[model samples]
Target: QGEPLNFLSYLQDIKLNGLDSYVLFIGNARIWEELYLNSLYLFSDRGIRETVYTAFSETDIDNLFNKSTKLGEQLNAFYRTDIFSLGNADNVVKEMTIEHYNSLEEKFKAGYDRYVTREQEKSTIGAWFNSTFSLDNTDLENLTTIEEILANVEATNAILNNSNAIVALTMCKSSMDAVVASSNAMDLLGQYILRVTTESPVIRAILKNNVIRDAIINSDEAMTQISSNENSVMEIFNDLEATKVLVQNQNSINKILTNNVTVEKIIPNLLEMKYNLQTSLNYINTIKSNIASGKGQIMAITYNEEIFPILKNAVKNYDGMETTRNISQRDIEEKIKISDAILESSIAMATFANNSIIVNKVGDRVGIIESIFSKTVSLNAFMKSTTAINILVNKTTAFTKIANNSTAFNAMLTISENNVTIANNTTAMGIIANNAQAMSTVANNDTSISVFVNNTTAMGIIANSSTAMTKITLTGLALNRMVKSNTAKSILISKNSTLQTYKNNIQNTIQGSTAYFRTITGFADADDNPPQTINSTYVGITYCYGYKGNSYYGIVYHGYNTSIEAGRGNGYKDETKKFITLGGARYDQSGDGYFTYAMYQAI
Candidate 1:
């Protein structure tokens, strides 16, 4: 029941209007809460320093499936392969699962810890969010009496002590700036190249003809400049910080409580923050547009006139010369795809955040009844379904035509299973997805500051495009591409061409697009686990064959099934719903085997 609550609804709602819907939904606290809560999975916690939860629903939990035994047999199958074994195998699986758990915790913590600082700024911002909530014009004339100031202070402190809204606002501002700068820089670079090419045909010709030498020099110089002047590229970040301080000025003033300050000042600052943020965004886009408009012509002249002729004359010959226009166009398309994806992601994030900073702005808080909950759907079917095998087939067939490449098949299967685990593991990854505080506050009639921390963490993601963009990490990219085309023929092609071709194409073209585990640190060999080196491979393969047996029947009845029972009546099928328990081997948290080859090796 704790599994990704309302995940389908969240997916559906976001898709209703494409990315825009996501932005709009995330902008609202209620919607964000639902999304955050839906993201949680077993062992995943958010915000709270201590996440104490009861795993077993019933106190007298006597009967459960031997999950540890199951894991061992699975390890055995992998050992039979030439690549994996027992010595390094068990550690691999255990460490990987733990790493998955830790990754969720790490991300949630990073976002939440930052969120806590922001929550404290909410009430100050709230006065600005609710500029028209209730006109206290008559009250405005009267200076805030000591008691009223104290009362407001008490109220503000109570509501915004752990203000998640503030942090979300900060990230929102940051994201907009990033989106703007990246967009502008890319556009401008293209224009600069075009201007050089168009104005100087000889330069363009030299560039084309002198590709072997000058192109390398140019590329090297460009890389060096980018590295040395990295800060110039981050100009957007500097601008966003300014925008944040502007909007948060009033909120800061409220904390100090000087007698001369008034709500009127707060309103202006609020207006300024919004204006400045927009101004910054607009300025960046203009630069992008200008560059986009002129880049092609400049590049043409620079390459054709200057570079090409010089190189041709010096060499007195031309080899493999042709129109570079096609390659240029292709590069332009790829760059545009990347830029558009970044832009669309930003727009969607901003839209979900409702384009409004949700500081302690008190309005009519909307509450949804049972907004996020686990559907009583059977996850058992997830493991049993042919979808996993189909994914494996797709992964294998496209790269090469070999039917029984067990290594690749095993690789694909491992990833598929890992993905399922990841999905289930993240069923409740962040508490900010839930609107309530993590703990009840006893000092005041408010929820603990941690709840707001969770909220802010969720808000940061909801308000920024970088959130999802980050899911695709370098390590994940590496792991996702491990399967080969030959594996597809062995595992996926079979008699079904439809599934085989589709999977093959996907793996070949999208090497890092595995549906299973995203780029996570523990999926590969590192300090925590054995390196996936040759020795570990030998150990892994040995482990698999050593434990060889009927995986399903071996543990359930400790022997092969002689009855050949059919239908759902088999005890193996019936007992699947029983509580899944782990083996004693997994408890060794510090053991190297748990951390290394075994975790990722065992399919």
Candidate 2:
């Protein structure tokens, strides 16, 4: 309408657009494509085109050419096709004033510069791409699409530079591979390269830097250097191998030296190697020669000079062999001599040169001679036996009287034979033997003859005393009679002596005393004395037998200057007359009664 706009023209503008065009025209190609495609689609519909032409054909020519009428048609065409909406053409400006153009150009320049300068910091690809181009996130920020960012000039430049590096280094890679392939010792060359390249700065620089590595890869001088160093290293290896071979050959030399035949021959050339062993071997040969000749002076010399001295003192070191002398360590000759001497001495009483047989015979036979001499010298002291019979027979004169008493001797023999039996039966014999006089008296008396038989004391007396034995025969009746008579005589003598002595003592007690006898009758206060008594004697005691008698003749004491002062009128009186009349009594005391009284005078 105003400046001639159409679908083909809008499509042509988008196709010819640059970022400058984008600044002038706000929408992108997708918006322009939508407007162009939709217009063509509606134009291709025949019914729609016919309907539009029929409607225009019916309209007035004036209305079709009128300004308002043409404006309305254009509006209807725009609504039907949606070209302005889809193209966003309302926001586009085909031209601008100089002020506005310059203002917008400045903004575009600032934004473009800011986007190109911004760094892409978040992703590894972004950072690598940015760093590879020496660009950053600001380079990507103004870019509207991935294509724009990737298609940047600095990015293209980085790709070209990396391609150059890759191509250059790849050529060097072939060179290194060639070096590995060319070497017969590729493993050693690889190891040397790996090791020196890591630590040696010159090798590292030559390997890492493409210029240096490429020059080394292309130059034949490096191969010559490698060849020289390898030759030197191999020389050292050959020297070590030679040393190893020499060490292995040392065993072959030792094998020849240690062989027995070779060792024996080696000693003639090097005799000090055998030293003491060779000397001992030589001495062994000498010893064999001497021994075969049966004249080994070596052994004799050793025995006399070395062995004998030690042997002589060896026995003295033992516990009880200190006194040992001249005992041979080993002597077949001396031992056989001793054995023959013993045999001869036992049989023929032979004498030997050593006098050993004679000395031994003296020990054997001298004992018998010494025994006989000793017995003869101490003949009386000799024990009696068959052995002593000769001694006794030779001394008969000394014991002639004792020897002649055959009967006594025979009796003594019998007694000795029977002594144990006799002693066993005689329990009380010791007591009887100790009383010899009594035993003899009993033996002589016929009345006491039986006394010696039954009592152990009597029997012991008879068995011990020969006189008693001769007197009494031990029979049962005699034994019984002896026991009874002895006991009877002992009792009679003891009783008769005691009885006579008692009687005599009683008679003498009443002798040389005055006597008085009376029968008195009296009440307790009356004094009627039907009596006559006179007594005068020293003071003594009268024993009366009766007291308190009613009517009877009983003995009572009447003291009147009599031997006893127990009767009336004796010693109890008062006043000047001083009559001390003792009270009288009956058989027992009745306080008044009659009784006979006797009074004795003291001598």
Candidate 3:
């Protein structure tokens, strides 16, 4: 059966509203497994390939991870100040969402449960195994639309090296509102100040006082509150930054793990491998049919006229089926490559379902370490201590081994590393712990984001560094399994195989070491309406940052002065009184200078 062009939802056409939508795709288990088993023969049939994504996942240590180490130093300011009361009810709501996540457990749970319930009712899991799996109607339509839009933008960019093409990237209103809400909450330390004010009538009264307030104010307490709130917001952004880094790392890790898993699920999931095992029974049936029709050996060619055509047509059908299968196989290969590359980020945060138990144990240790770190002198000194440092090193190492060895260990590593790192720095551990607890309360979140990424040589090998396929050999069990799977078998197991040699040569190429980011020239020229981009000649952009899906569309303008129109593209309404608003125009609306644009390209 062909894929559906549309799907019904609750007896209504829940129309896919935009052409520029994008989502990460995970292939079915069978496809994943096939890719794994047939690795050696990959590209052997002239139909296989691997797609790639070009994106950067790097971060500056001190600026992000180190800064994220402590939340207490930053969060305490608002906890003791008057920042929250400055905003209205909308601000208060955002403040609660951001600053008081720990107190909103019920809301998070309710939201998550509602999401799960909706999935259960939709029977989405069931659809994934049938014809529907090949093409979810709405998903296909959305992808097609998005690709077309991206094509147009990409085509225009080819002719000009302009930043104007990047103006099309805009978050949805709901997503942007969420961003605004989150930003506002993080800002002003809203709830922290409000909480302190409400909790202490004296502080509120003092802040409200005008005449005697400045002269007689309790400067010590007021300073403490303000400082604490500033630190908290700072700490939050720090974690956000780390999350961003670790997320990228997870994505790289996923390429290795999930790539293997893709090949693991095929034969078991497809049912054909089992049927193939019963070939003798099927052949027996064929023999019986021939005998029952009074046919002898070589009857089709020697004794029967009707049987000859049947045999000939059967061979032709088999050839045709093989050709069709090859086409599908090629598509899967391309899809898998994209998945592996794109996964570099999401894989950084994917669930360690298999490693949950180990992670729980590590989680416990993290709790103990986090608690100890919450103490000032001990942790501060521990950072400086030879003995105390050794203990800390031991713990870090233990968790490292665990994470590498098991899924649960990896999870433990994530929570512990983030917490302990924060504890070690001036950022303060208590604030982060509070926020971690709050994170469960605020917008919720992923994976063994703490995988080993330091093996440079191995990463180089996996990246196919100046080596022949005959010399490659992936050492990990997961990788070896992929090499042995049906998906990869055709790629590597063939009599005239080149990929097997390739795999052996690069077998030791570690999972997360290669530099995924690349600088490319003529990127601006790749978009549709080239925006005025400055210094385009001197700088090269990375491939992963190129225009994706329909995410890149039309153009946008940024108004700088009063001479031009206003309110267009800045997310306001149309009552502009005939002014030339921002409205997707390139060149900053003033038609001078250049703007910054970010996009992705295939690696």
Highest lDDT model number = 2
TM-score of each: 0.15, 0.09, 0.15
Supply the TM-score for candidate 1. 0.15
Candidate 1, RMSD to the unseen true structure:
37.2
Compute the lDDT for candidate 3: 0.27
For model 1, residues 330-375, the per-residue Cα lDDT tens digits are: 4444433332232223222222122122111101111100010011
Error of 3 at 464 (Å): 49
Candidate 2 lDDT for residue 240: 26
> What are the per-residue Cα lDDT tens digits for candidate 3 across 120-203?
234342222112113223332222222232233332222112111111111112211221233232221222333332122222
Q: Candidate 3 versus the native: TM-score?
A: 0.15
Error of 2 at 24 (Å): 99
Candidate 1: global Cα-lDDT? 0.25
